[PDB]
Design an enzyme around this catalytic site. Structure first.
Site, PDB file in Angstrom:
ATOM      1  N   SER B  16     -46.686   2.101   8.958  1.00  0.00           N
ATOM      2  CA  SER B  16     -46.026   2.796  10.078  1.00  0.00           C
ATOM      3  C   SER B  16     -46.185   1.938  11.327  1.00  0.00           C
ATOM      4  O   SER B  16     -45.196   1.492  11.915  1.00  0.00           O
ATOM      5  CB  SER B  16     -46.668   4.164  10.337  1.00  0.00           C
ATOM      6  OG  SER B  16     -46.129   4.774  11.503  1.00  0.00           O
ATOM      7  N   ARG B  39     -48.498   3.763  19.501  1.00  0.00           N
ATOM      8  CA  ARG B  39     -48.743   5.081  18.919  1.00  0.00           C
ATOM      9  C   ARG B  39     -47.742   6.043  19.542  1.00  0.00           C
ATOM     10  O   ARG B  39     -47.245   6.965  18.881  1.00  0.00           O
ATOM     11  CB  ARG B  39     -50.119   5.641  19.272  1.00  0.00           C
ATOM     12  CG  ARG B  39     -51.312   4.808  18.968  1.00  0.00           C
ATOM     13  CD  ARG B  39     -52.513   5.678  19.163  1.00  0.00           C
ATOM     14  NE  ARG B  39     -52.564   6.758  18.185  1.00  0.00           N
ATOM     15  CZ  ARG B  39     -52.978   6.599  16.935  1.00  0.00           C
ATOM     16  NH1 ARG B  39     -53.373   5.398  16.509  1.00  0.00           N
ATOM     17  NH2 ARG B  39     -53.022   7.637  16.120  1.00  0.00           N
ATOM     18  N   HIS B  42     -45.082   5.663  17.924  1.00  0.00           N
ATOM     19  CA  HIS B  42     -45.360   6.207  16.603  1.00  0.00           C
ATOM     20  C   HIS B  42     -45.070   7.664  16.646  1.00  0.00           C
ATOM     21  O   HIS B  42     -44.154   8.115  16.005  1.00  0.00           O
ATOM     22  CB  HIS B  42     -46.819   5.985  16.179  1.00  0.00           C
ATOM     23  CG  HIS B  42     -47.145   6.547  14.829  1.00  0.00           C
ATOM     24  ND1 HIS B  42     -46.339   6.355  13.725  1.00  0.00           N
ATOM     25  CD2 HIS B  42     -48.206   7.266  14.396  1.00  0.00           C
ATOM     26  CE1 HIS B  42     -46.893   6.928  12.674  1.00  0.00           C
ATOM     27  NE2 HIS B  42     -48.025   7.490  13.054  1.00  0.00           N
TER      28      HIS B  42
HETATM   29  C1  COJ Z   1     -53.953  12.329  15.021  1.00  0.00           C
HETATM   30  C2  COJ Z   1     -52.721  12.282  14.118  1.00  0.00           C
HETATM   31  C3  COJ Z   1     -53.012  12.629  12.818  1.00  0.00           C
HETATM   32  N1  COJ Z   1     -52.109  12.619  11.931  1.00  0.00           N
HETATM   33  C4  COJ Z   1     -52.431  12.954  10.533  1.00  0.00           C
HETATM   34  C5  COJ Z   1     -51.812  14.416  10.397  1.00  0.00           C
HETATM   35  C6  COJ Z   1     -51.596  11.923   9.582  1.00  0.00           C
HETATM   36  N2  COJ Z   1     -50.151  11.684   9.938  1.00  0.00           N
HETATM   37  C7  COJ Z   1     -49.274  11.404   9.044  1.00  0.00           C
HETATM   38  C8  COJ Z   1     -47.921  11.079   9.485  1.00  0.00           C
HETATM   39  C9  COJ Z   1     -46.880  10.752   8.374  1.00  0.00           C
HETATM   40  C10 COJ Z   1     -47.316  11.018  10.800  1.00  0.00           C
HETATM   41  N3  COJ Z   1     -48.023  11.241  11.869  1.00  0.00           N
HETATM   42  C11 COJ Z   1     -47.401  11.176  12.987  1.00  0.00           C
HETATM   43  C12 COJ Z   1     -47.972  11.339  14.216  1.00  0.00           C
HETATM   44  C13 COJ Z   1     -49.174  11.593  14.743  1.00  0.00           C
HETATM   45  N4  COJ Z   1     -50.306  11.819  13.964  1.00  0.00           N
HETATM   46  C14 COJ Z   1     -51.504  11.926  14.735  1.00  0.00           C
HETATM   47  C15 COJ Z   1     -51.089  11.539  16.214  1.00  0.00           C
HETATM   48  C16 COJ Z   1     -51.844  12.415  17.282  1.00  0.00           C
HETATM   49  C17 COJ Z   1     -51.384  10.023  16.439  1.00  0.00           C
HETATM   50  C18 COJ Z   1     -51.040   9.409  17.793  1.00  0.00           C
HETATM   51  O1  COJ Z   1     -49.817   9.121  18.030  1.00  0.00           O
HETATM   52  O2  COJ Z   1     -51.950   9.239  18.632  1.00  0.00           O
HETATM   53  C19 COJ Z   1     -49.501  11.708  16.218  1.00  0.00           C
HETATM   54  C20 COJ Z   1     -49.004  13.097  16.811  1.00  0.00           C
HETATM   55  C21 COJ Z   1     -49.100  13.279  18.347  1.00  0.00           C
HETATM   56  C22 COJ Z   1     -48.754  14.676  18.884  1.00  0.00           C
HETATM   57  O3  COJ Z   1     -48.124  15.511  18.132  1.00  0.00           O
HETATM   58  O4  COJ Z   1     -49.146  14.991  20.060  1.00  0.00           O
HETATM   59  C23 COJ Z   1     -45.912  10.864  12.831  1.00  0.00           C
HETATM   60  C24 COJ Z   1     -45.070  12.098  13.279  1.00  0.00           C
HETATM   61  C25 COJ Z   1     -45.487   9.657  13.743  1.00  0.00           C
HETATM   62  C26 COJ Z   1     -45.821  10.722  11.256  1.00  0.00           C
HETATM   63  C27 COJ Z   1     -45.009   9.377  10.899  1.00  0.00           C
HETATM   64  C28 COJ Z   1     -45.556   8.245   9.987  1.00  0.00           C
HETATM   65  C29 COJ Z   1     -44.437   7.343   9.482  1.00  0.00           C
HETATM   66  O5  COJ Z   1     -43.585   7.828   8.660  1.00  0.00           O
HETATM   67  O6  COJ Z   1     -44.376   6.160   9.912  1.00  0.00           O
HETATM   68  C30 COJ Z   1     -50.058  11.511   7.619  1.00  0.00           C
HETATM   69  C31 COJ Z   1     -50.281  10.012   7.183  1.00  0.00           C
HETATM   70  C32 COJ Z   1     -49.466  12.211   6.267  1.00  0.00           C
HETATM   71  C33 COJ Z   1     -48.060  12.867   6.142  1.00  0.00           C
HETATM   72  C34 COJ Z   1     -46.995  12.081   5.353  1.00  0.00           C
HETATM   73  O7  COJ Z   1     -47.297  11.031   4.787  1.00  0.00           O
HETATM   74  O8  COJ Z   1     -45.832  12.495   5.308  1.00  0.00           O
HETATM   75  C35 COJ Z   1     -51.481  12.208   8.067  1.00  0.00           C
HETATM   76  C36 COJ Z   1     -52.863  12.117   7.332  1.00  0.00           C
HETATM   77  C37 COJ Z   1     -52.989  12.470   5.854  1.00  0.00           C
HETATM   78  O9  COJ Z   1     -52.358  13.487   5.423  1.00  0.00           O
HETATM   79  O10 COJ Z   1     -53.753  11.762   5.111  1.00  0.00           O
HETATM   80  C38 COJ Z   1     -53.936  13.250  10.608  1.00  0.00           C
HETATM   81  C39 COJ Z   1     -54.783  14.314   9.779  1.00  0.00           C
HETATM   82  C40 COJ Z   1     -54.193  11.813   9.868  1.00  0.00           C
HETATM   83  C41 COJ Z   1     -55.610  11.175   9.612  1.00  0.00           C
HETATM   84  O11 COJ Z   1     -56.284  11.505   8.597  1.00  0.00           O
HETATM   85  O12 COJ Z   1     -56.054  10.325  10.439  1.00  0.00           O
HETATM   86  C42 COJ Z   1     -54.366  13.075  12.143  1.00  0.00           C
HETATM   87  C43 COJ Z   1     -54.998  14.350  12.887  1.00  0.00           C
HETATM   88  C44 COJ Z   1     -56.557  14.505  12.931  1.00  0.00           C
HETATM   89  C45 COJ Z   1     -57.088  15.798  13.668  1.00  0.00           C
HETATM   90  O13 COJ Z   1     -56.791  16.958  13.182  1.00  0.00           O
HETATM   91  O14 COJ Z   1     -57.796  15.666  14.747  1.00  0.00           O
END
Ligand code: COJ
Ligand code: COJ
Lengths: 209, 209
Positions: B16, B39, B42
């Site tokens: 990503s 990010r 992102h």
């Molecule tokens: C933090 C985060 C997580 N995202 C998880 C859900 C992770 N995302 C995902 C994705 C596909 C994604 N994510 C995103 C964003 C953010 N995601 C974020 C953000 C805040 C990052 C940033 O931009 O700073 C952002 C949304 C800002 C806000 O909302 O304010 C996108 C929307 C860009 C999306 C896109 C990825 C791609 O296709 O390139 C994962 C990889 C799986 C879903 C899939 O594959 O379809 C998942 C972890 C897992 O399930 O193992 C999370 C639990 C991950 C981790 O373990 O570290 C963690 C929260 C931990 C917790 O509960 O504290």
């Protein structure tokens, strides 16, 4: 300095939706889907997102149908879940998200997926005529699709609006390709998001403002 | 069908951020601001947002400085607050949002503003060297500016990333125009958002991944 800005939210709301309607092209949208379009656009500040919006023939009807008959929203993220303005829900519809559920990381481990996806397993007895909301995770969407293929109980609809650079694009069209008997709504392409999703939910669960 | 999608989040995370770096133009950004940019991009799926990103000379340094020395984040929304991955915070930094605080609607009433703005009043004893995060409400930003002008205690920084069609644009440049002695960061224009904001917060409180 002396700031001359507006301090009235509904006023803000009135001129916000106003500016948008005035800018976004909402022709192909159903008088009801439009609503969806405009808040979605509202929540994101992008008048173009509309370009990617896509609703299966009966998505709005059947989800607004269900979200009205009580049907539960199953959020793949918490941002999305916290975007749903309870104050606007038809009948105290539950906003469910098992992302941060104690057993998801383990479901991810044994089955080999992502929390967001394994999480769906906790959905197992809530797919039944429900409105799925995935505005953050395509693996969740892909996983949901496998379930269905393998004899799963079709949700009431499917908000395939996860946003991403990897997998979101495909997961979404896959939803469109074979949605196993259920309507959908996705923002084809990379765009999507908790805001737009929640915004869409907000629009569905209560039109206008 | 047989779905051949990726089920490993870090893998997903790796490709990503990879796809993005490969697409977003991040030249004028500080090796450290860049992180922020990517990010943000992102979280939104828009490689162009970068076009609007704007960080005051020392915004990153002084907030990453503070978010490291304990300094509290003061979110104007809850979406933003729920985007902050606690797991990534330098020193259990508090993610504060008094939007849904019991006295905000009344502060809005007597003073004549919006919940999001009056809410800042509850911030009164937490501005002190803190990192403000407003990724949803410009009145909040405007109000914060008046406070400062009227002898208020400058926050450690200011995330002016509210998103909107009315007031967000101005509130933000106003931040830039006269930020009463504090660094900022805004997404000039209508764009902004809880995701980008939270994403930005997430980047600040812990670089890379
Ligand atoms: C933090 C985060 C997580 N995202 C998880 C859900 C992770 N995302 C995902 C994705 C596909 C994604 N994510 C995103 C964003 C953010 N995601 C974020 C953000 C805040 C990052 C940033 O931009 O700073 C952002 C949304 C800002 C806000 O909302 O304010 C996108 C929307 C860009 C999306 C896109 C990825 C791609 O296709 O390139 C994962 C990889 C799986 C879903 C899939 O594959 O379809 C998942 C972890 C897992 O399930 O193992 C999370 C639990 C991950 C981790 O373990 O570290 C963690 C929260 C931990 C917790 O509960 O504290
Ligand atoms: C629901 C909502 C609210 N927004 C409030 C905070 C309201 N927003 C604002 C704004 C400027 C804004 N909002 C937005 C979005 C959403 N806002 C939404 C969403 C979900 C709407 C949608 O798209 O469906 C969307 C974010 C989807 C998600 O995150 O998933 C924008 C980012 C588009 C922003 C832009 C307006 C403009 O400039 O044109 C208000 C007007 C003030 C800030 C300012 O003026 O700067 C505020 C109420 C108040 O303070 O009186 C809220 C409490 C409003 C209410 O009383 O009804 C309510 C939550 C109630 C609750 O706690 O349950």
């Amino acid at each position: 300095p002396e700031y001359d800005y507006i301090r009235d939210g509904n006023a803000i709301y009135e001129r916000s939706f106003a500016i948008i309607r005035a800018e976004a092209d909402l022709s192909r949208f159903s008088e009801e889907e439009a609503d969806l379009a405009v808040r979605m656009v509202h929540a994101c500040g992008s008048v173009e997102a509309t370009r990617q919006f896509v609703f299966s023939p009966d998505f709005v009807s059947s989800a607004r149908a269900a979200l009205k008959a009580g049907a539960p929203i199953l959020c793949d993220a918490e941002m999305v879940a916290h975007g749903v303005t309870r104050a606007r829900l038809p009948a105290g519809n539950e906003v469910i998200c098992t992302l941060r559920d104690p057993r998801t990381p383990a479901l991810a481990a044994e089955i080999g997926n992502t929390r967001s996806a394994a999480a769906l397993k906790l959905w197992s007895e809530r797919l039944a005529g429900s409105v799925v909301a995935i505005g953050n995770a395509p693996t969740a969407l892909f996983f949901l699709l496998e379930m269905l293929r393998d004899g799963a109980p079709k949700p009431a609809a499917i908000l395939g609006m996860p946003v991403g650079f990897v997998g979101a694009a495909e997961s979404k069209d896959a939803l469109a390709e074979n949605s196993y008997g259920v309507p959908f709504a996705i923002v084809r392409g990379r765009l999507g998001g908790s805001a737009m999703t929640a915004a869409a939910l907000n629009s569905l669960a209560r039109p206008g403002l």
